């Protein structure tokens, strides 16, 4: 599985430290932040994200739509596109491969039409 490509537990629990050490490091999104437990959203994002690369077979938190549907101001694709750059931007500098930064891209991108509180078409 991607998860377990990516370096296992280890690795993701390195991706998603590092990964929000950049998002309230980013006036772009780090105020959406400012009322959250920063070790407690790690908890979750480790979660669901091992659970989306394959490497847990269950996600028991709140559906992607849920979860940020309701937040102000409401996110669009400039939020969307700062999140995907500063994970790409993690893995990129956790030294994985090219190859499994697209792939690893591809599982969040898949995620943002519920994400952004989008019609479904
Ligand atoms: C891009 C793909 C994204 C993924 C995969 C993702 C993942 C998650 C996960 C797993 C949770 C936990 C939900 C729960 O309580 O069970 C969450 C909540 C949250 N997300 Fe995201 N997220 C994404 C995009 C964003 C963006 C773009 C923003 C804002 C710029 C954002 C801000 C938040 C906030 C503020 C919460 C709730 C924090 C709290 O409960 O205090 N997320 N997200
Ligand atoms: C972002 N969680
Ligand atoms: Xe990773
Ligand atoms: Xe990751
Ligand atoms: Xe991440
Ligand atoms: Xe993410």
Do not use: C
Not at 51 to 58: D, K, N, T, V
């Amino acid at each position: 599985s991607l998860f377990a490509k990516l370096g296992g537990r280890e690795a993701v629990e390195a991706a998603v430290d590092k990964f929000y050490n950049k998002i309230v490091a980013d006036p772009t999104v780090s105020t959406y932040f400012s009322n959250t437990d920063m070790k407690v959203q790690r908890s979750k994002q480790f979660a669901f994200l091992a659970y989306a690369l394959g490497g847990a077979s269950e996600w028991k938190g709140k559906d992607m739509r849920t979860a940020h549907k309701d937040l102000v101001p409401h996110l669009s694709d400039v939020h969307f596109q700062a999140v995907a750059r500063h994970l790409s931007d993690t893995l990129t500098e956790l030294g994985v491969p090219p190859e499994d930064i697209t792939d690893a891209m591809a599982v969040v991108a898949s995620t943002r039409t519920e994400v952004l509180n989008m019609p479904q078409q």
